[PDB]
């Protein structure tokens, strides 16, 4: 029912051993060197 100006799909593949790192405030190899998320991030993460 809501409406936003733009949405961005950020598509990638990760290791299982890094999966919890797709979130604000995470660290590690991937979270620090591969995919960092903003602290004021607004959106939703999907994975399978």
């Amino acid at each position, epitope marked *: 029912d809501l409406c936003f100006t733009n949405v961005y799909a950020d598509s990638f593949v990760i290791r*299982g*051993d*890094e*999966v*919890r*790192q797709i*979130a604000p*405030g*995470q*660290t*590690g*190899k991937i979270a620090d060197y591969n995919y960092k998320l903003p602290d004021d991030f607004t959106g939703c993460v999907i994975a399978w």
Partner: antibody, heavy 128, light 108 residues
Framework: QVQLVQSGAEVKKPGASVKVSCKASGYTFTGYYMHWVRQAPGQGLEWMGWISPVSGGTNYAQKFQGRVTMTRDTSISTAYMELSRLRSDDTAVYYC??????????????????????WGQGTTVTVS | ALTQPASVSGSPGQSITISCTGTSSDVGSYNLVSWYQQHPGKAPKLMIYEGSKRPSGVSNRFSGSKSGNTASLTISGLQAEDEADYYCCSYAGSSTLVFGGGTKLTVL
């Protein structure tokens, strides 16, 4: 500056009961549900129950339902846990434990999250 | 209630992983898995909480991961001080959050 002190070592006979105290300071006492854990000498941990110092809410493990009883005194900020019908395998070290956050976590999860402050020691030995 | 290896060995500088397998009803439906470290004769210390969030003061070398029904502790840059027992924790349906065997970490 969170300080936690327990009672001393205790020895009991099989079939008797044991009463341990848990006196805290340096924080809001009723704002933290007090959890309890026991550990046999040389074995792993075993959680037993938790008490709410506010409104006196309590809930025990289904492993110990009917044998363990808690009360608390907010006037001196102390918890008290009693084990009844003691047997041989209850010789162990016992701690209380302070839960991590405040009970204002609308979606947080308290007081089921975890334990950041662990207490010193209470050893209960039950031998004939 | 959870199963984790009893003892795993590693080398200094290595990144080591510790597994802990549960079920779909306790670890597979809740993002509430943790890792505790305890030294011999010492008080346990919460290293990893709420999946991979860390209390203030814990080193960044300890991270967490969750896959299906499996929890994983990761340690980057293994050191001599890392020798201790590690327990995985997860809500199981009642009271409540107990550890496991006690993955004893040793350094070669």
């Amino acid at each position: 500056q969170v300080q936690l002190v327990q009672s001393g070592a205790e020895v009991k006979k099989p079939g008797a009961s044991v009463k341990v105290s848990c006196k805290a300071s340096g924080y809001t006492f009723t704002g933290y549900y007090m959890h309890w854990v026991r550990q046999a000498p040389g074995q792993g941990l075993e959680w037993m129950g938790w008490i709410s110092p506010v409104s006196g809410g309590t809930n025990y493990a289904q492993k110990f339902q009917g044998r363990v009883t808690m009360t608390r005194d907010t006037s001196i900020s102390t918890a008290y846990m009693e084990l009844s019908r003691l047997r041989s395998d209850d010789t162990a070290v016992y701690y209380c434990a302070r839960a991590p956050l405040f009970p204002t976590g609308v979606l947080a999860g308290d007081y089921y999250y975890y334990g950041m402050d662990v207490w010193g020691q209470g050893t209960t030995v039950t031998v004939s | 209630a959870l199963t984790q290896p009893a003892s795993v060995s590693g080398s200094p500088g290595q990144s080591i992983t510790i597994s802990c397998t549960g079920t779909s009803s306790d670890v597979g439906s809740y993002n509430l898995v943790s890792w505790y470290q305890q030294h011999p004769g010492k008080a346990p210390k919460l290293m990893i909480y709420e999946g991979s969030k860390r209390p203030s003061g814990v080193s960044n070398r300890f991270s967490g991961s969750k896959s299906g029904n499996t929890a994983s502790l990761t340690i980057s840059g293994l050191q001599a001080e890392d020798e201790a027992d590690y327990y995985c924790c997860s809500y199981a349906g009642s009271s409540t959050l107990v550890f496991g065997g006690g993955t004893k970490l040793t350094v070669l």
